[PDB]
Each structure stands twice: as C-alpha cells, then as structure tokens.
Design a protein around this ligand. Structure first.
Ligand SMILES: CCCCCCCCCCCCCCCCCC(=O)OC[C@H](COP(=O)(O)O)OC(=O)CCCCCCCCCCCCCCCCC
Ligand SMILES: CCCCCCCCCCCCCCCCCC(=O)OC[C@H](COP(=O)(O)O)OC(=O)CCCCCCCCCCCCCCCCC
Ligand SMILES: CCCCCCCCCCCC[N+](C)(C)[O-]
Ligand SMILES: CCCCCCCCCCCC[N+](C)(C)[O-]
Ligand SMILES: CCCCCCCCCCCC[N+](C)(C)[O-]
Ligand SMILES: CCCCCCCCCCCC[N+](C)(C)[O-]
Ligand SMILES: CCCCCCCCCCCC[N+](C)(C)[O-]
Ligand SMILES: CCCCCCCCCCCC[N+](C)(C)[O-]
Ligand SMILES: CCCCCCCCCCCC[N+](C)(C)[O-]
Lengths: 86, 223, 169, 223, 223, 86, 71, 84
C-alpha cells in the first residue's frame, strides 16, 4: 500500500530530523564545556546546564519558522491522502 | 390556539430547543472556554461541570434574549390574515431574518455556498465555475445551510482562545523546573510546587472577571 | 474470584519490576488500574478455567450454598477465616512471582559491580534496555505449568463451603 | 393545592433545585475547599468524593435553612387576597428579599452592575445614560444579574483559600530535600519521607476542626 | 395495604442507603486505612481496590447490621398505643436511640455542641445557654448534628493510625540507602531493591491479618 | 486446549523476537559510548541518547517489512484457530 | 445461555493476542530509548487500527460466525 | 498572524530571562567556592550544595516582587490579544 508505506516512513524521518538539531547543539556544547573544565582542572555541576539552556533557546528562536512550514505541509498532505479516493 | 397546525409546530420546536441551543448559539463557545481554563490550571475535579455549564448558560441567555423577544412580538400580531400559500410563506420567512442575520454575521460564506450547492444535486454536485459573481447571497441562504457553518466557525474560535490562555502557565512550569535543576534537586516533581503559583497568579489577574466581560463584549457593547 | 486476582497481581509485579510504570491498559467496568501484562494473564487464566469445565463447578457451589445454608436460617460468613483472606491472596502471588524478581535483581547488581571499572558507564540506563527482554525470556520458560498451577490448585471447590459459612439461626 | 398555576410553579422550582444548590449556594465553596485540601496532602483516592461531598452538603444545610424557613412561613400566610397584577407582583417580590439580601453581601458591586447594564433593551445609538437611586440600585438589583456574579466571586474566593493551605506543605517539601542533600543520599526520592510529615502536621494542627468551624463562622454568627 | 406514608418512607430510605453507609459508618475508617498501608508499601494496585473495598464492606456489616435489626424489632411490636402527634413523635425518636448512642460514643462532644448551637443561634437574641439544663440536651443531640461531627472524627483517627505504620518502612529505606553508599555501589536506585524487601517482610509477618484484628477489636469482641 | 496454550506461548515468542534487535543495538551503543568516555575523560551524558536515537531509528527502517509480514501471518492463524471448528 | 457466553468469550480471547503483542513491543522500544514519560497509548492506537484494517477483520469474522451455524 | 507569532516568541524570551539569574548566581557561587578549594586544599563534595542553596534562596527572596509584575503584564496582554 504505497500510500501507507509513504506516510508511515515519512512520520519517522520527520521525528528524526526535527529532534536531531537541538540534541546536536546540546551535545557539542556539552563536550566543549566538559573539556574546558579539564584543561582548567576546575569543576562544578551547573555551568554546562546553564550554557545548554541558552544554546537550545537560540536554536529554537532561529529554526522554529521552518518547523511550522514542515508540519503544515505534512498535515495537509495526509488529509488529502485519507480523503483521496473521493 | 387558533390553528391546530400552529399548535403542532410550536410544540415541535419546543421539543427541539436543547439541540438548537447546543448547536446554534454562543453556548458552544462559552461551554468550551471554561473547561479549557480548568485544564490549563491543571485541576481534575473542580469546579463541577454542571457549575461551569450553569454559568455558561446564564451568560448566553443575555446575548440571545433580544432575538427571541423580537420574534415573539413579531409573531403574536394577528393584524393580517392570509389570502394564500405564498402570502403566508413569505410572512413566516420574513420573521426568521432576525436569526438569519445573526448566523450570517459569524459563519464564513464559502462553506455556506458549498453546502447550498450540495443539497441541490446541481451539475453532479460539484463543478468548476469560470466566473465569480455574487448575488446578494446573504438573503438567499437557507438556515439548514447556515447552521453547520456557524458551529464549525465557532468551535475553531474556542480552540484559538484556549491556545492563548495556556501560555502564561507554561512559562511558570518551565521556570520552576529550571530553578530546581539549578539547585540540583533533580529527583523532585515540579507539580508539588508549581500548582499554588498558578492559583495565586490567576487570583491576582482576576481571570474570571476579565474573561466573562470580554466574551460578552464580543457580541454586545456596553458603557 | 480467587484464582484470577492472583494472576493479576503477578502481572502487576512483573510490569513494575521491568519499569513500565506508565502502563496503557484500560478497564472502566471494574474500576481497577491495569497494565498490559496484568490484562494478558488475567484473560489467559479465564480461558483455561472455562476450558477445564469450571463453569459447572460455579453453579454447583451456588446450589450447595442453598442446601448447606438457607436464607431463613440467617446464614452468615465465618469471621476468623475472613480475617486471613487478604494475606493468603498476597502470599500466593508472591510465592508465584519470586523466580522473576530474583533474576531481575541479580542482573542489576551485576551491572553495578561492573560499573566499578568504568564509572562513566550509566548502568541504570543499560539495565532499562535489558530488563524487559530478560523478563519475557524467563517468563517464557516457566510458562506451561501456568495451566495446571491455576486450573486446580487455586480453584475454589464446593467442599470448602463447610468452613467459610455457618448458620446462626 | 390552590391556584393551579401556583402549583406548577412549586413543581418547577423543585425540579430545578439541585442546579440552584450547585450554582448559587455556599456548597460551591465547601466542595472546592475540601478537594484542594486532599490534593495539598497529596492523596489521590482518600477520602472518597462521595464522603467529601456528603460533608459539604450537610454543612451547607445549616447555613441555608433559616432562609428557606423564613420564605416558607412568609408564603403560608392567609393575610390577603390580591386585587391586581401590580399588587400581586410586588407581594411576590417582597418575599425573595431575604435571599436577594443574602446574595448581595457576597457578589461584587461592579460585576453586578455590569450585568444589570447588559440586560437593558438595545438601542441604535449607545443606550441613553442613567443613574438610579439606592433603593433600586443598592437595595434591589435583579436576581438574574446577581446569580452569576455570585458564582464567579465564590469560585475566586475558594481558590484564594486553597493557596494559603498549600504554603506550609511547600515549606516542608523543600526543607526535607535540603536535609537529604546535606546527608548526601542524593538518589532517594523525598516523597517517601515528606508525605508522612505532612500527615503528622495536619493531625497535630487539627485542620478539619478549624476548617469546618471557620467556614461556618464566615456566614453564621455564633455566641 | 398498610400505611401509604410508611411505604414512602421505606422506598426513600432504600435509595439513600449507600450514602449513609459511605458517610456515617465505620466503612469510612476501614476503607481509608487499607489504602494508606497499600501506598506505604509502595506498590499500587496490589491488592486491588476491589479486594480492599470488598473486605472493608463485609467487616462494616458485623458492626452495623445488629443495630438496624434491633431497630426493626423495636418497631414490629403490636402492644403500643398512641393518642397524638407528640406521643407518636416521641416513640419514633425513641426507636433511633440505638444508633444515636453509637454516634455519641465515637465523636467529639464539643464539635457536636457547636453544630447544635449553629442550627439555632442565627435565630437568637441572647447569649445565655444555660437556659436548658444539660440532662435533656446532652442525651438528645440531633442526628444531623451528630453525622458530620462523626465523619470528621473518623477521618482524623484514620490518619493517626496510618502515621505510625509509615515509620518502619521509612527506616528500611534509610538502611538500604546507607548500605549502598557504604558499599560504594552508588549508581543504583534503591527503590528497586527496597520495594521487594518491604513486600516480603510485611507478607512474611502477616501484616494484613494483625491489621484486620486490630481494627475490629475497637468495635467488637470476636469471641 | 492445546491450541490455547500454543497461541499464548507464541504471543510471548513474537514479542521477544520483534523487540530483541532494537534493544541489542541500544545496549551495544550504551557500552561503547560509556567506555569511550572513560578512555578519554569526558563527563557528557546526552551523547548516548543522541547516538542511540539514530541507531534505533535506522533498524526500524530496515525491519519495517518483516514486522508486517509476521503479524499478518499470526493474525490469520489465530482467526482460523478461533473460528474453524467443526 | 451459559454455553453461548462461554464460547463467545473463548472467541474473543483469540482476537486480543496480536494487539497485546503490539502494545508490549511499543512499550519496550520506548523504554530502550528512556522516554519513560511517554504514554504508549498515543502511539499504539493507530498501529492497532491499521493492523485490523489490513486483516479485514469484519469480513473474516462475520463469515466464520455464520458458518458455525450451517453446514 | 503577527499577534500569535509575537506571543510565542515572547514566551521563550520570558523563560530565558526568568530562569537566567538564579542559574548565574548558582554558577558563580559554585565556581568561586571551587577555586577556593584549590588553595589550602581540602576536597569536599557538599559545600557547593550547601552554599548554592543560600544563594538561590536569597536571590528569590529579593527579586520575587519583580517576577509577579512581569507575569501579570504578560497575562493581561495575551488575554486582550485573544478576546479582541
Ligand atoms: C431558570 C428558570 C427558567 C425556567 C423557564 C420557565 C419557562 C416558562 C414557560 C413560558 O415561557 O411560558 C409561560 C406562559 C406565558 O403565558 P402568557 O401569560 O400568555 O404570556 O405561562 C405564564 O403565563 C407564566 C407561567 C410561568 C410559571 C413558571 C414559574 C417558574 C418559577 C421558577 C422557580 C422559582
Ligand atoms: C426520618 C423520619 C423517620 C421515619 C421512621 C418511621 C419508620 C416506620 O415507622 O415505619 C417503618 C417503615 C418500614 O416498614 P416495615 O419494614 O414493614 O417495618 O419504614 C422504614 O423503612 C424503616 C426506616 C427506619 C429504620 C431506621 C434504621 C436506621 C439504622 C441505621 C443503620 C445505618 C447503616 C445501615 C447498615 C447497612
Ligand atoms: C512515528 C512512530 C509511529 C509511526 C507508525 C507508522 C505505522 C506504519 C504502519 C505500516 C508499517 C508496515 N508497512 C510499512 C509495510 O506498511
Ligand atoms: C515556552 C514554550 C512554548 C512552546 C509553544 C510556543 C507556541 C508555538 C509556536 C508558535 C509560533 C510558530 N511559528 C514560529 C511557526 O510561528
Ligand atoms: C455479614 C453481614 C450480614 C450478616 C449479618 C451479621 C450480623 C453480625 C453477627 C455477628 C455475630 C458475632 N458473634 C457470634 C460473636 O456474636
Ligand atoms: C519511538 C518509536 C517507537 C516505535 C514503536 C513502533 C515500531 C514500529 C514502527 C512501524 C514500522 C517501521 N516504520 C519505519 C514503518 O515505521
Ligand atoms: C508494532 C508492530 C510492528 C509494526 C507493524 C504493525 C503492522 C502494520 C500493518 C502491516 C501491513 C503490511 N502490509 C503493508 C504488507 O500490508
Ligand atoms: C524548552 C521548551 C521546549 C519547547 C519544545 C517545542 C519547540 C518548538 C516550538 C516552539 C517554538 C517557539 N518559538 C521559537 C517560535 O518561539
Ligand atoms: C519561581 C519562584 C517565584 C515565583 C513567583 C511568581 C509569583 C506570581 C504571582 C504574583 C502575584 C503578585 N501579587 C498578587 C502577590 O502581588
């Protein structure tokens, strides 16, 4: 059922790319702040969380318009397929 | 009563009233908004649904009463008696226009026309139009076409209002959870603390007053 | 009811040990919380009970209840055994679930001891990946006795009516 | 027995009775308060709603009885028979003043007045202005205005109380976490220890007696 | 045939029966204690709410069924005679004393007296209370005064009991955590270990049996 | 009877088979990343999540087909066992 | 009456087993990702619907239920 | 839908600000005590937890008046945008 196959595969691909960007940013920031604590040999729990929050908020301010474009496109498309037979 | 069929029609309408109220009146909106408020505050049981619905019905009464009264005063006049079918039919038709106006003010015409063309079997139910030509379609449209459009048009509006009402509380939730992570108290569920903050926030805004007033003001205007 | 409540408890214990705290199953008729495993084993016990003809013993014990104690003699349930009842129901479920709990404990402490050599390893997050597989694997071996271990050894039988009730008139 | 229409009125009233109790009586406040206390202690099923609402209904009965008795005695009185519509209607109206005067102490003036402004017949220009003297305006606003203003103000005042009830438990919940962190047992969930403390505190405070007394004292006067 | 009003009273009573049981009977206490202990053991839905409510219901009947049966045996008594509404009222009231005594035994005198004042004193122009010497009123508090005062005392007793049952489980949680730290086997959540231990320990000691006896021995002798 | 026992056993057997591969790869990725973070001392904790999300989604793409063939064959089998009696 | 109740329950049991599988699988993959806070029912409901539609359940079932009463 | 877009953007801005300060105070205290452990060295895990708690509590005690005013302003603004 090429229609069910398409809609089902695209749902998962969209989950993977919508979620990837915030987690990539968070991971890279995490690594750099973890390193800096080693070369400084200076340690605390809170600095990485503090920076990660800002990094993710900026990520959302920037990309969020595109999240809307992608979701609207998919939303229309699935309805048209569901009611396509008539 | 002076006519057995007039009597029958009156009783039938009286029997259908609750479905008309539930499907063609601002009650549709007010009913939904209060339940969304309760959800956004995060309360399961309280206030009771019949408390909220009672208030919603009282408020809707003010908005709709002027039309009911106008129609009653119009129909109770025995000042003319009718020569023929068409004379009667037109006399009745012209009485509903106070309601027909109110539905046409708030529905969205593209649906109304779509349904009109659909209950007629015309041109196999849907066909293209080369030309776009508007024919005082406001007076043509049947009530049986207007009613669904109004319903959908107003449900959507309710969802919109509920969206706006959620945002302030979402802020509170994320803020509490972040300051708890700053303290490192990672095990503790925010809902134990965030709820009272929401309560006092709503109490200080006096959300019930603002909300109730604004709802009415969308339909009426008052000094 | 007694044979079914034990299998329901068993399923709740398993689904709690494997995590799964936010289980999905639905049941509004009885008003009791339910999980996927609990619902499954509660159904399965019922079909084997019916297939063994227990439906005859249900009407048998109904008729005997009238012959052995009569509405007009003020028949009354005995108090002393009723005071034991809840604890017997709990005990049978724990005795039956015990083999899966121990293996799920040992599997977690084994990862804990392993973590001593690699302290950045998140042994907890690893155990969450493992434990549902281990739980099904082990329950699949000791599965077949679940037929007889309920159909007889837990089913109520009409001779028991002598002790749980007496006539007070 | 009596006037056939008076009989109809009595039966209609008795049919609507539970919605009135649920929407224009202190039952609204007590129902909310008890459930909020259960949530503050953190219990999901104890006591049952069927117990809490039973208590709330009994406590409300004391507060409301004297008004029902006074209105009953006022109508079971053979004093007069009536000449005219205006005499009868003003005799009826003078019987409800006890209830009207109960609602007036607790609804809020500005919201009441806004609703009274809402009922007046529409005008094409904005309505002709007026100011009215106290014997109508202070003493005698209409009940179809008072009733929803009452419901809304009651809900608000209930949330306010719930807010204060939460504060001491929030204090407990924080302190206990900070002490567990001071002992280093960072991984243990503090709910397992905070819950019994909350219960101890509530029984030593004897919160049920205080709540049940003070809530009644807000309406009764006892010496 | 019989009497048509006693028929109404019978049918009415049988509709209210479950709310009376739910609000003025030891069921209130039994159903609470079990659910609290279940939460303290930390594994909800074992035993089922069906099991717990079923047992609590059965035990409540041993306490209450003799009192109802005694009342019906009091009324089915062919030797009485009456002369007036007063002489009948007295005899019907006298029939309920068997229940009244039970409520008086298990509830607070001062909260009862407070509601006994509150039914009236909105009527009263005076402060003196001595005006009836106690011997009548101390025996005859009204049942509507007794009911909520009984329920509010039963709940408090339930919490008192459950408090003392929480303590040992808390201790067990502290012991487990301290052992994991002393072993340095840090990154394991203790709940996974301690909930099996709590369960096995309580079942191996038959906590539910001792609990059931300890509850009934407040109300009966089992022998 | 034996049909009941057989069908119930098979249900657990299928759960085991289908769920097994994702949980394996999520384990292996958890071990490798945890070791790597001891071989070079870095105290990040989202990196496992970031990698294992991609790991699980990839094998859901791969096995998307066999998943539907197995479940169809099982459904047909049990519907036959239930209804075809004579 | 009790015989028909017995056999109807028996038939109803068999039909659960695929959906039971679906539910336990989904729950396991979510725990494998650590999303403990996700309610599975949201994800598992559509998979059940599409499974039943692919089987064409109502055809098979209404056929067999009638064939049990006539040769 | 400029209004809707604005409301959304403002929400995140508010979360970023209102959570910002307490994390900064906790950061600075944790860092300063950390460095102070490197001299006269004694190494103890809990001192950051003990002292940061006082930091954050005192910060909230001072600023909590501000928070309510910002929140109120936002709530009114959105209620009006919705009901207009
Ligand atoms: C909220 C309460 C609203 C209840 C709606 C009552 C509907 C009345 C029906 C109607 O309009 O025909 C009246 C109909 C009008 O006839 P007309 O005089 O020829 O205009 O009959 C009457 O004259 C009025 C009789 C109304 C009796 C209802 C009293 C309700 C009391 C509420 C509790 C106090
Ligand atoms: C309120 C006014 C009181 C009316 C009493 C008159 C009754 C009468 O005289 O005719 C009898 C008449 C019954 O007719 P009979 O059965 O033929 O005797 O009315 C009744 O239904 C009896 C109701 C009164 C008995 C009260 C018993 C209360 C026991 C409390 C137990 C609570 C927990 C329940 C346990 C389960
Ligand atoms: C995003 C997670 C949930 C996605 C569920 C998609 C269901 C697809 C159902 C059909 C799968 C079998 N297939 C591809 C052969 O059709
Ligand atoms: C504080 C978190 C709030 C998250 C939800 C915010 C509202 C949804 C985003 C609305 C705007 C969408 N956009 C950018 C496409 O216009
Ligand atoms: C179980 C409720 C229905 C039957 C009524 C039972 C009434 C209580 C009888 C208790 C007798 C106890 N005993 C023998 C020690 O007196
Ligand atoms: C967080 C994801 C949970 C997914 C659980 C269901 C797995 C099966 C998904 C349908 C089959 C694979 N595919 C690619 C078509 O989606
Ligand atoms: C959660 C179990 C795994 C996901 C697959 C569930 C079955 C979906 C329906 C399969 C349909 C197969 N197909 C397209 C060949 O018909
Ligand atoms: C920590 C907040 C998590 C929110 C998750 C959803 C993010 C995308 C949708 C909201 C976008 C808001 N924005 C950037 C338009 O303002
Ligand atoms: C994050 C912890 C502190 C949150 C404080 C937020 C208070 C919101 C309620 C403001 C009420 C203002 N009021 C009415 C007291 O003036």
């Amino acid at each position: 059922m090429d229609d069910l196959v398409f809609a089902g595969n695209k749902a998962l691909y969209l989950v993977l790319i919508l979620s990837g960007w915030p987690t990539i940013v968070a991971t890279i920031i995490g690594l750099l702040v973890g390193l800096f604590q080693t070369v400084t040999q200076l340690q605390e729990q809170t600095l990485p969380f503090g920076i990660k929050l800002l990094g993710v908020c900026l990520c959302l301010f920037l990309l969020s318009g595109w999240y809307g474009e992608v979701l609207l496109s998919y939303g229309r498309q699935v309805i048209f397929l569901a009611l396509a037979k008539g | 009563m002076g006519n057995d069929i007039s009597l029958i029609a009156l009783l039938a309408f009286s029997t259908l009233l609750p479905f008309i109220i539930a499907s063609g009146t601002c009650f549709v909106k007010f009913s939904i908004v209060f339940v969304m408020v309760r959800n956004a505050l995060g309360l399961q049981q309280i206030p009771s649904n019949m408390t909220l619905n009672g208030v919603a019905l009282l408020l809707s009464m003010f908005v709709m009463w002027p039309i009911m009264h106008d129609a009653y005063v119009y129909f109770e006049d025995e000042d003319v008696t009718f020569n023929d079918i068409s004379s009667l039919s037109k006399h009745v038709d012209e009485g509903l226009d106070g309601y027909r106006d109110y539905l046409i003010k708030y529905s969205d015409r593209e649906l109304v026309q779509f349904f009109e063309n659909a209950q007629l079997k015309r041109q196999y139910g849907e066909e293209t139009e080369t030309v776009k030509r508007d024919k005082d379609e406001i007076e043509k449209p049947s009530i049986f076409a207007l009613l669904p459009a109004y319903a959908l048009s107003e449900i959507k509006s309710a969802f919109k209002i509920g969206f706006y009402l959620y945002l302030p509380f979402v802020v509170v939730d994320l803020v509490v959870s972040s300051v708890l992570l700053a303290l490192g108290m990672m095990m503790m569920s925010p809902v134990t603390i965030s709820t009272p903050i929401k309560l006092v926030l709503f109490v200080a805004l006096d959300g019930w007053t603002l909300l109730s007033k604004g709802l009415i003001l969308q339909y009426m205007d008052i000094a | 009811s007694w044979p079914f409540w034990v299998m329901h408890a068993l399923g709740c214990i398993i689904d709690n040990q494997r995590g799964a705290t936010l289980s999905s199953s639905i049941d509004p008729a009885n008003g009791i919380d339910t999980s996927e495993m609990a619902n499954f084993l509660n159904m399965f016990a019922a079909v084997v009970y019916l297939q063994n003809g227990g439906l005859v013993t249900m009407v048998d014990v109904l008729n005997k209840s009238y012959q052995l104690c009569d509405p007009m003699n003020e028949c009354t349930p005995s108090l002393p055994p009723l005071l034991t009842f809840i604890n017997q129901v709990a005990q049978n479920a724990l005795v039956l679930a015990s083999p899966v709990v121990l293996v799920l404990l040992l599997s977690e402490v084994f990862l804990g001891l392993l973590s001593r050599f690699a302290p950045q390893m998140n042994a907890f997050a690893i155990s969450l990946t493992v434990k549902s597989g281990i739980a099904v694997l082990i329950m699949l071996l000791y599965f077949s006795p679940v037929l007889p271990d309920n159909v007889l050894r837990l089913s109520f039988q009409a001779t028991g009516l002598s002790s749980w009730f007496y006539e007070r008139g």
